[PDB]
Every structure is written in C-alpha cells, then in structure tokens.
C-alpha cells in the first residue's frame, strides 16, 4: 500500500523510460488514474526535474502530455503526468505486427508534426521509436502523443538561435535499431537525425521487421544498415518511403528540414490511394 506522500497511491509498472520506469498511480483528491515517475534524492545525477522542465516548455503543443506535478517528497523526486493509452509498439503487436498502408500514412503525418513542434522549441528528441509514441484517451484516442524527454537535448540557443557545434567521437544515444547512420558513425545528433529515425520506424511498420534485426553487435547493425541501400530496404512499397529517407540522409548537420515537403509526399500518396481521412486505424477495425 505504497503512497506518494499524502496525495497519490502507487500501482504496477506500466512503462520503461530512458532513466527510470513509469508506474500506474491514483490521484487521491481527484478519483483519477495518473502516470508516476520516481527518482531517489541520492541519485548521482538527478534528471527528473530537468526532464519535467522540457515537458513544461512544450506544454500546449498538440500531442504533448501534461505534467500534473513535479517536486521532492520524502526520499524521492516525483513526476506525475496525465495517463495516456497504449504505445504504437503495443498496438503493432495486436495488429499481427503489420500495419496497412493507410495506418502508416495516418501515423506518418502526425509523427512528422510532433518532431517538427519539438524542433520549433529548440530541442531534439534523440530516441524516436515506436515505444515513445502513445495514443490518447477518450476523445483524444485518434491523437498520437510523443513521450520521454530524458535523452532530449537543446540544439540551438533560444534567443540567438546559435546552433550547437559539430562534433564527432560520440557514443550512441538511443536505440541502435532506429539510429541514423551518422549516429552510428559517432557524429553529434541534429534535427536531420530525428527525421531519419522516423523513416526507419515507418518502414518497420510496413515490413514487420528491419533487415538489421535478428543477427560486436553494434558494429554488426551499423554494417548491415550501411550495407543495405534504401532502394533495397523499400522494395515493394511506394516510392515516397525511399524519397523520404534519401532526403533525410542528404541533410547537412545544421540544416533546417522541409517538414511540409515530407508531409506532402505522404498526403499525395494518401489521395492517390483513395483512403478516407477518417482516423480509423487498423486497431480500431479489430474485434
Ligand atoms: Zn521539479
């Protein structure tokens, strides 16, 4: 019967984050479920308040979760957030690990816009992956949320817009599976790299798997990733997936991406395919 001070009662683990897990909670005053993150005050490098600050900086963005509370309570730093629905990875497993083209296109449109909004607030995410996208609840069930800013970094000064310097010899941050080729090569991440990851995530949803899945290990993924041409990766799928990836890989370090061009590629394909823009996802057509 664990209680976060007076206000919240703790429940089962419901998520795994870059720094700590997410637990199911109840807000005692609301009669309401919430998501809770905990960090021991003795932690060597505390980051919970740091990550909460980014969220709050993003607040009011479409598809950004809201923070109910951040503070110290007892021997913990605590972060309480609005509870969201299943991740795209979860829903992918319920859909037999294959999404229809219509689902992938509806998802791409939202996912490019979340990344675009984050970049507009001067941050890069750096762990773009299916588990960090969650569907909303109730009336927001048709909205894709982006979560987890623990690996997120500022890429430009807010007032001056001075972009962070080019560096190399970096250790990989984020999941090796969706990492950009330049990330595997040790280059400092930038805007281009969040968009390149998203492309691997979209092809993952079309294919059910990537060619560098299921094979020292990091050199081996990097090899296979660098050995597999985009044309080969995207064979049998609309040309827009390859075009998306080619453009991302063309981008120079500090370049601003053309988010509208990438979204339009997919919107045009959507028109040609004859799909209704009805936000009816593959999982909604499940029993
Ligand atoms: Zn705080």
Could you walk me through the main structural features you see in this protein, from its secondary elements to its overall organization?
- With about 290 residues, this protein is of the alpha+beta class.
- It has helices at about 50-55, 90-95, 100-120, 180-185, 190-205, 215-225, 230-235, 240-250, 260-275; strands at about 5, 10-15, 20-25, 30-40, 65-75, 75-80, 125, 135, 145, 155.
- It folds into two domains: about 10-25 and about 35-85, 2-Layer Sandwich (Phosphorylase Kinase, domain 1); about 85-285, Orthogonal Bundle (Transferase(Phosphotransferase), domain 1), CATH 1.10.510.10.
- The chain is about 35% helix and about 20% strand.
- The strands form three sheets. It has a six-stranded antiparallel β-sheet with strand order 1-2-3-4-6-5, covered by helices on one side. A two-stranded antiparallel ribbon has the order 7-10.
- A hairpin with an 8-residue loop joins strand 8 and strand 9.
- Helix 3 (about 100-120) runs antiparallel to helix 9 and helix 5 (about 190-205) runs antiparallel to helix 8.
- The longest helix has 20 residues, at about 100-120.
- Bound molecules: zinc ion.
- Zinc ion binds next to helix 1 and strand 5.
- The PDB classes it as transferase.
- The entry lists the keywords Kinase domain, stem cell reprogramming, transferase.
- It forms a monomeric assembly.
- Human Casein Kinase 1 isoform delta apo (kinase domain).
């Amino acid at each position: 019967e664990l209680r976060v001070g007076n206000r919240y009662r703790l429940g089962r683990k419901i998520g795994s984050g870059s720094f700590g897990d997410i637990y199911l909670g109840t807000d005692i005053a609301a009669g309401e479920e919430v998501a809770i993150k905990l960090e021991c005050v003795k932690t060597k490098h505390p980051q919970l308040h740091i990550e909460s600050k980014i969220y709050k900086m993003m607040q009011g963005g479409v598809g950004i979760p809201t923070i109910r509370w951040c503070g110290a309570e007892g021997d913990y730093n605590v972060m309480v957030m609005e509870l969201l629905g299943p991740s795209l990875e979860d829903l992918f497993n319920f859909c037999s690990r294959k999404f229809s083209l219509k689902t992938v296109l509806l998802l791409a449109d939202q996912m490019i816009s979340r990344i675009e909004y984050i970049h507009s607030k001067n941050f890069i995410h750096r762990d773009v992956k299916p588990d960090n996208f969650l569907m909303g609840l109730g009336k927001k069930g048709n909205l894709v949320y982006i979560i987890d800013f623990g690996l997120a970094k500022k890429y430009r000064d807010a007032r001056t817009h001075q972009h962070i310097p080019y560096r190399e010899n970096k250790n990989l941050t984020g999941t090796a599976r969706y990492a950009s080729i330049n990330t595997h090569l040790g280059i400092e991440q930038s805007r281009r790299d969040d968009l390149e990851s998203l492309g691997y995530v979209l092809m993952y949803f079309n294919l059910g798997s990537l060619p560098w899945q299921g094979l020292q290990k990091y050199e081996r993924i990097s090899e296979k990733k660098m050995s597999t041409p985009i044309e080969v990766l995207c064979k049998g799928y609309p040309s827009e997936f390859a075009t998306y990836l080619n453009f991302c890989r063309s981008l120079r370090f500090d370049d601003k991406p053309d988010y509208s061009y990438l979204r339009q590629l997919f919107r045009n394909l959507f028109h040609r395919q004859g799909f209704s823009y009805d936000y009816v996802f593959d999982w909604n057509m499940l029993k």
